[PDB]
Amino acid sequence: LKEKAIPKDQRATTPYMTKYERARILGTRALQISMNAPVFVDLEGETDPLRIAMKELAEKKIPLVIRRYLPDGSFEDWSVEELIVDL
Amino acid sequence: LRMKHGTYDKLDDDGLIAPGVRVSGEDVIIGKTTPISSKRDASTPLRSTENGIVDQVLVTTNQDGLKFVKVRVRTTKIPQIGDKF
Amino acid sequence: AGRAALYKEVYNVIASDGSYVNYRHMALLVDVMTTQGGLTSVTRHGFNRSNTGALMRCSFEETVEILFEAGASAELDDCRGVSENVILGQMAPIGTGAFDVMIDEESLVKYM
Amino acid sequence: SERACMLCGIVQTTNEFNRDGCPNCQGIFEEAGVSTMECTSPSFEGLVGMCKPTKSWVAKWLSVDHSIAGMYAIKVDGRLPAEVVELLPHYKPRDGSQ
Amino acid sequence: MNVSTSTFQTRRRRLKKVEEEENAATLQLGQEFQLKQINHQGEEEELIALNLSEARLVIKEALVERRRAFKRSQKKTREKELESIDVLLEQTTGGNNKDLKNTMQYLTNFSRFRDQETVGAVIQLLKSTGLHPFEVAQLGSLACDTADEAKTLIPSLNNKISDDELERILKELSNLETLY
Amino acid sequence: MFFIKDLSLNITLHPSFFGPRMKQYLKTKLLEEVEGSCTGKFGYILCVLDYDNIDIQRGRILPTDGSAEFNVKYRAVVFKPFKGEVVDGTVVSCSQHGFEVQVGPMKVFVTKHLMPQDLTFNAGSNPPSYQSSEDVITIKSRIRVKIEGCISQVSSIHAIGSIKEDYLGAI
Amino acid sequence: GQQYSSAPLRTVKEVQFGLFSPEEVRAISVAKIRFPETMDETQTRAKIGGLNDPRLGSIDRNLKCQTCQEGMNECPGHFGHIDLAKPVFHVGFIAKIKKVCECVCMHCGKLLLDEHNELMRQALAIKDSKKRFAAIWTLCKTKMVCETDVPSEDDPTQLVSRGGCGNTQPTIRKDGLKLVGSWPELRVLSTEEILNIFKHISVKDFTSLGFNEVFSRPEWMILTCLPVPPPPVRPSISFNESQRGEDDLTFKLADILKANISLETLEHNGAPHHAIEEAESLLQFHVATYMDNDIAGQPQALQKSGRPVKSIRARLKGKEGRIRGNLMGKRVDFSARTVISGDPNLELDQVGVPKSIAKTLTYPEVVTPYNIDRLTQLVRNGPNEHPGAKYVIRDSGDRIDLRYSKRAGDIQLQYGWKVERHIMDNDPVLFNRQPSLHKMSMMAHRVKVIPYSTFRLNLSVTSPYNADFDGDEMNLHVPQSEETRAELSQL
Amino acid sequence: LRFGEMERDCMIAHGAASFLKERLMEASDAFRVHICGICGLMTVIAKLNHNQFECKGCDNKIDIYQIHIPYAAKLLFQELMAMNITPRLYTDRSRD
Amino acid sequence: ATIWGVRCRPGKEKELIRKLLKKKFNLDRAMGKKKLKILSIFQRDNYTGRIYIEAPKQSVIEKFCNGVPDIYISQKLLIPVQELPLLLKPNLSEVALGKTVRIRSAGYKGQLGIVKDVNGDKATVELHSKNKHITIDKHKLTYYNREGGEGITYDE
Amino acid sequence: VGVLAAQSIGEPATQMTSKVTSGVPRLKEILNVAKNMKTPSLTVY
RNA sequence: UCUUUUAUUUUUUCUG
Ligand SMILES: [Mg+2]
Ligand SMILES: [Zn+2]
Ligand SMILES: [Zn+2]
Ligand SMILES: [Zn+2]
Ligand SMILES: [Zn+2]
Known part of the structure; x- marks a missing residue:
């Protein structure tokens, strides 16, 4: 049943990236870069996957989406570049 | 059969390490074979976290006549940082 | 009134020795203790007699008795519990497992 | 060494059979002309430590009430000879047959 | 065994032992072959069936737009049709999958209607009859002549249609048969 | 009997394969995984429809591994034989024990204990054939068979056929 | 285990509970266990039809299970089944059986009350199964007779026939491991009669009670077909090379099976009805001590050595049990403990690590073109220097140990492989004080390689750990994945 | 080293779910077990060499799923199944 | 009917009935006109761990079974009729391994040691004065014979 | 937050050192809703 | 061309 999906409008969640979120996206992208996924930013002599993921998040160029599960089983898809990561 | 990872070169013909020779890590000190109806070794290796010098070795016979052995190993402990006083 | 009085008593206990603990920790304690009708004790007979996950309940003291009860009653556990996900060995919804990460197909193709 | 009689069930040493025969069945055995060795067997089960012939209701079932206090087996394997089966019509097989 | 294809009906199969209704042609279908079915957006609809001529047409289409997809990816009588469809499949698939080839051969030596307009007319007529999709697919697939004969082929269809109307649809179908 | 139906599949894609060619690579893998497969539960998945409009939704990234599981929704024509159905097919091979009839993608086996008496095998024909007083059956001939039973194997389905009722025979 | 499988990769999302049916046990078991002898008979280990039957699972390293052909490393174990000649109660459900029996009629198998009664409708209205069951039990305790008819709501004088028999109900009591009914005509209720009434109970009758027809039907409460666990649940111990000891559970299974053999033989032969009774009592005792070794008010079962037998509740209940001891928390690889020291010359977020612990622990990193040269230098250095590696994982999963491989220069690194490089500087590693009483008592630091045998930590950090340098010990846990180093760094 | 209940508890407090996974599953003990859709028990005769998966009693051969769980959890579930409790593992969320 | 079944240790029904019955002839010989009320004693091979005695009163049976070891007189039941x-x-039923060696330009000069494992191009030696590999x-x-003396380089 | 509060309330309990009972026994008594009370008290203004 | 072992439980002792 796709009725549980909440469209882009009506979303009643925080637009700011949660610290747990940012932890997971950095870890996920660091792992992908380690396992030889493509790189979306210029490699300025950076070899550490975690730091490459840091630079990618800073440039807001990670092709990832957080499905932000609501308590009742509902959910909201948030694009990572659309999330404002300030902390 | 199943021998231990310890080095067996140090052991003498009697199968017992003599004093004045180092034994380190898993080096065997007593050479044991446990035949049953092929040699099927059952030796007692040295402790992996222990190193030192074999200080003394004694061979006797228990009350049942079976051979008994006691092997004393000596080491020097100099104080290090983690040592407690 | 029972909840707020019990908060006041806990705060008195914490402050008797001079220790200061933030209000909302006590608030959340009293609210879990009073979330049902009465004051559910933090004991064998209290919160552990609730309707939470069977595996979570047996993770507390009375394990085999609760497991026998769950088998008799054919209880279904939804595996939304921390103890459940620890026991079965999945990434529990703790702080990062509350969501999942998804590839952005459209953005990936568009940037190329 | 132990042997069990096949008619009255008295059990005792093969030696004591060889000396005194069968105390309960001596008359019948002599009348039929059969030695006690053939009418005894070594295979027996279900002993009975037997005291009161005239008062034991177990004995009333097992047909020992007319015998002496003694040593009796509920089962004694074998078929009794015809030369005593005919002369003791009231007997029944002790192996549970019939 | 292998990576299987999942299912959309959230089945209630919670420890119930094998209780599937007996597989039969008397409408005693499986649990997943039911009249009701859930669409992609989540709406309940009636099962849609189709005849052999529909099978050939939809397969031909699906192959065609698959070819057009391959193409834009790389940018950046009874014999000619057989040969064209053969070379179509050969250029489409690698060649190892012989099952599609066998199905091609079967569907192309057996099907009644060769025209999309005739196909649409028959679908509209079967809609007017309003019978089960399985039933109408069978009727458009198999060849029949007489009402009693057709009842014999489908014994389930006892109390579903009048003899006069079955004869009517049958003669209408007979006229709509194409002569290759 | 060739029903169009709703199917979906989980495809796990290793992180190295993320890229511009995400679409076409997954497309090809899906076609290999679906074409030619067979399952007793669903029948026989012959051909996936609307290739160009298959929706590859937002795929999960697995927790332990970066591998991404995509649930693809699609339409596909599925075939499952049913007990008690009349179908015509072509004989592929003949023997004293049976002659194997090709029905769609799969073969139907017919036993002599369910055949009319008049039909009689003759081994003097090359290939071996069955003769009657009104018709002759041979490999290159269309024959109408009545499926009564189905048995499912690991990667196939088999059907049991007979011809006793009216209009069941060779045309 | 560790091998390719073509099944889908999956995570569980519910756990259903219930009971085995005897038919389910019979259908799911791979073998029947009938011979009490476990092994050693005629110097053959494959005791067919007995305990530790190879069909139940591999007993040792043989690469041959006779069921899956996958070896002990992969075999999950397959149960046997033993059909008891008579049914026997479940220890865990003694109170439950008593409760149901006093709730329901012991002749017709019907509840003493019905929706005709107001209190009964109120009790049934409770949605939650446990409180509902409690309500019905409290109501049916007072009733001690089956009324064939009950007054009607429309007219009290009018009596409506509720159905069922008219037999007066007995007072059930618990004496030891059996139930005794006082009608007084006091008598022990036969477990066969109890199981008879339980099957005769209707579908609605227990659906109203806290039971489900599909999951846990009330007759399944009683053991008729005991499932015999596979060898991995009951592994054998070795005193010496020749002296082998069967596990406590295996010993209890052998005892139960001997009891069952005696009982079925005694059934087949003459049944005095009291020898049968004592044999049934012994079988129930053996099952009860096998499955629960802490029965109140009853002699405790002793092993050969005179010590309590390690039973199911014994292994699942205590802190060292399977849940608390082996699942809530449990032993860990890629970790070290040692004494701690204060080092004011170390940054706040940084911890000194002994060189030996550094050379011991490793973190596996996948090969990339970014660090191919670095990983080549480390694989050349080998395990024997601090910067190096201990293992290399090939794509096929074949793992080569550098200490035992002399061709380390020849081994060329390829993308996709994994090298178990040692922990270098700046690697996040969790650092733990053992009385972890609060969140801040477990934090991740940055490794600093230093040659000495203590964990040097910057000394402002001792406050959250509540740590001294008076012999305290702390742990270091190395993350094994980039995912985990990331979450350790930013959380 | 024994990742105690206190240690697990502090990790829950911290929120490092991937660490708690990798500590309790990858480090301590990881076992792949096969289960079937109908009953969801670890009694699937899975001959991975022949790629044939069987579940007697439910007769199915298709709805077979592999799950990675700790050996401790596997052995607890075996223990309970001996104990006539059903630790039954399933997929479809029904109550939602 | 007064037949009472009594528990006793299994495997010795034969011997316990033997001791009871021999004791009974001894008693009956000993006593005078009054002689004790025990009617019969027996057992079964199929039913182990138990004996069956037919006697009128519990104190008579207790008095009779005093002095008999191993009999569990405390468990008796009156068998119903x-x-x-x-x-x-x-009817019922390389030559460098494990050798002594010295170092000659390193910080550990003059250290004797024993070769344990060699990984190619490099050998591991345990210092004979310190606890290190x-x-x-x-x-x-330089390699030596088992005993101290003549020294040779790596040419053996 | 639940675990956070549990640890935040448990940590002071370990370091706890006109009358009314206080300290660890009092915290235990609050946690364990007890019908009987060591030192009942009523403050009436 | 790799592999290759270190029983179990009951007790006691102390360590933080
Ligand atoms: Mg200290
Ligand atoms: Zn005689
Ligand atoms: Zn197996
Ligand atoms: Zn009744
Ligand atoms: Zn199953």
Whole structure:
């Protein structure tokens, strides 16, 4: 049943990236870069996957989406570049 | 059969390490074979976290006549940082 | 009134020795203790007699008795519990497992 | 060494059979002309430590009430000879047959 | 065994032992072959069936737009049709999958209607009859002549249609048969 | 009997394969995984429809591994034989024990204990054939068979056929 | 285990509970266990039809299970089944059986009350199964007779026939491991009669009670077909090379099976009805001590050595049990403990690590073109220097140990492989004080390689750990994945 | 080293779910077990060499799923199944 | 009908009935006109761990079974009359490894040691004065016979 | 937050040192809703 | 061309 999906409008969640979120996206992208996924930013002599993921998040160029599960089983898809990561 | 990872070169013909020779890590000190109806070794290796010098070795016979052995190993402990006083 | 009085008593206990603990920790304690009708004790007979996950309940003291009860009653556990996900060995919804990460197909193709 | 009689069930040493025969069945055995060795067997089960012939209701079932206090087996394997089966019509097989 | 294809009906199969209704042609279908079915957006609809001529047409289409997809990816009588469809499949698939080839051969030596307009007319007529999709697919697939004969082929269809109307649809179908 | 139906599949894609060619690579893998497969539960998945409009939704990234599981929704024509159905097919091979009839993608086996008496095998024909007083059956001939039973194997389905009722025979 | 499988990769999302049916046990078991002898008979280990039957699972390293052909490393174990000649109660459900029996009629198998009664409708209205069951039990305790008819709501004088028999109900009591009914005509209720009434109970009758027809039907409460666990649940111990000891559970299974053999033989032969009774009592005792070794008010079962037998509740209940001891928390690889020291010359977020612990622990990193040269230098250095590696994982999963491989220069690194490089500087590693009483008592630091045998930590950090340098010990846990180093760094 | 209940508890407090996974599953003990859709028990005769998966009693051969769980959890579930409790593992969320 | 079943240790029904019955002849010989009220004693091979004695009163049986070891007189049951006919029914049923060696340009000069494992191009030796293993190339180390004396380079 | 509050309330309990009972026994008594009370008290203004 | 072992439980002792 796709009725549980909440469209882009009506979303009643925080637009700011949660610290747990940012932890997971950095870890996920660091792992992908380690396992030889493509790189979306210029490699300025950076070899550490975690730091490459840091630079990618800073440039807001990670092709990832957080499905932000609501308590009742509902959910909201948030694009990572659309999330404002300030902390 | 199943021998231990310890080095067996140090052991003498009697199968017992003599004093004045180092034994380190898993080096065997007593050479044991446990035949049953092929040699099927059952030796007692040295402790992996222990190193030192074999200080003394004694061979006797228990009350049942079976051979008994006691092997004393000596080491020097100099104080290090983690040592407690 | 029972909840707020019990908060006041806990705060008195914490402050008797001079220790200061933030209000909302006590608030959340009293609210879990009073979330049902009465004051559910933090004991064998209290919160552990609730309707939470069977595996979570047996993770507390009375394990085999609760497991026998769950088998008799054919209880279904939804595996939304921390103890459940620890026991079965999945990434529990703790702080990062509350969501999942998804590839952005459209953005990936568009940037190329 | 132990042997069990096949008619009255008295059990005792093969030696004591060889000396005194069968105390309960001596008359019948002599009348039929059969030695006690053939009418005894070594295979027996279900002993009975037997005291009161005239008062034991177990004995009333097992047909020992007319015998002496003694040593009796509920089962004694074998078929009794015809030369005593005919002369003791009231007997029944002790192996549970019939 | 292998990576299987999942299912959309959230089945209630919670420890119930094998209780599937007996597989039969008397409408005693499986649990997943039911009249009701859930669409992609989540709406309940009636099962849609189709005849052999529909099978050939939809397969031909699906192959065609698959070819057009391959193409834009790389940018950046009874014999000619057989040969064209053969070379179509050969250029489409690698060649190892012989099952599609066998199905091609079967569907192309057996099907009644060769025209999309005739196909649409028959679908509209079967809609007017309003019978089960399985039933109408069978009727458009198999060849029949007489009402009693057709009842014999489908014994389930006892109390579903009048003899006069079955004869009517049958003669209408007979006229709509194409002569290759 | 060739029903169009709703199917979906989980495809796990290793992180190295993320890229511009995400679409076409997954497309090809899906076609290999679906074409030619067979399952007793669903029948026989012959051909996936609307290739160009298959929706590859937002795929999960697995927790332990970066591998991404995509649930693809699609339409596909599925075939499952049913007990008690009349179908015509072509004989592929003949023997004293049976002659194997090709029905769609799969073969139907017919036993002599369910055949009319008049039909009689003759081994003097090359290939071996069955003769009657009104018709002759041979490999290159269309024959109408009545499926009564189905048995499912690991990667196939088999059907049991007979011809006793009216209009069941060779045309 | 560790091998390719073509099944889908999956995570569980519910756990259903219930009971085995005897038919389910019979259908799911791979073998029947009938011979009490476990092994050693005629110097053959494959005791067919007995305990530790190879069909139940591999007993040792043989690469041959006779069921899956996958070896002990992969075999999950397959149960046997033993059909008891008579049914026997479940220890865990003694109170439950008593409760149901006093709730329901012991002749017709019907509840003493019905929706005709107001209190009964109120009790049934409770949605939650446990409180509902409690309500019905409290109501049916007072009733001690089956009324064939009950007054009607429309007219009290009018009596409506509720159905069922008219037999007066007995007072059930618990004496030891059996139930005794006082009608007084006091008598022990036969477990066969109890199981008879339980099957005769209707579908609605227990659906109203806290039971489900599909999951846990009330007759399944009683053991008729005991499932015999596979060898991995009951592994054998070795005193010496020749002296082998069967596990406590295996010993209890052998005892139960001997009891069952005696009982079925005694059934087949003459049944005095009291020898049968004592044999049934012994079988129930053996099952009860096998499955629960802490029965109140009853002699405790002793092993050969005179010590309590390690039973199911014994292994699942205590802190060292399977849940608390082996699942809530449990032993860990890629970790070290040692004494701690204060080092004011170390940054706040940084911890000194002994060189030996550094050379011991490793973190596996996948090969990339970014660090191919670095990983080549480390694989050349080998395990024997601090910067190096201990293992290399090939794509096929074949793992080569550098200490035992002399061709380390020849081994060329390829993308996709994994090298178990040692922990270098700046690697996040969790650092733990053992009385972890609060969140801040477990934090991740940055490794600093230093040659000495203590964990040097910057000394402002001792406050959250509540740590001294008076012999305290702390742990270091190395993350094994980039995912985990990331979450350790930013959380 | 024994990742105690206190240690697990502090990790829950911290929120490092991937660490708690990798500590309790990858480090301590990881076992792949096969289960079937109908009953969801670890009694699937899975001959991975022949790629044939069987579940007697439910007769199915298709709805077979592999799950990675700790050996401790596997052995607890075996223990309970001996104990006539059903630790039954399933997929479809029904109550939602 | 007064037949009472008594528990006793299994495997010795034969011997316990033997001791009881021999004791009974001894007693009956000993006593005068009054002689004790025990009617019969027996057992079954199929039913182990138990004996069956037919006697009128519990104190008579207790008095009789005093002085008999191993009998569990504390467990007796009065067998009901209905169970007796069925009970009494007649029919039931390299050369550098492990050698002594010295180092000659390193911080550990003059250290004797024993070769343990070699990984190619480098040998591991345990210092004979300190508790450490060290890795160093073999061509640069000198090997001796088992006993101290003549020294040779890596040419054996 | 639940675990956070549990640890935040448990940590002071370990370091706890006109009358009314206080300290660890009092915290235990609050946690364990007890019908009987060591030192009942009623403050009436 | 790799592999290759270190029983179990009951007790006691102390360590933080
Ligand atoms: Mg300290
Ligand atoms: Zn005689
Ligand atoms: Zn197996
Ligand atoms: Zn009744
Ligand atoms: Zn199943």
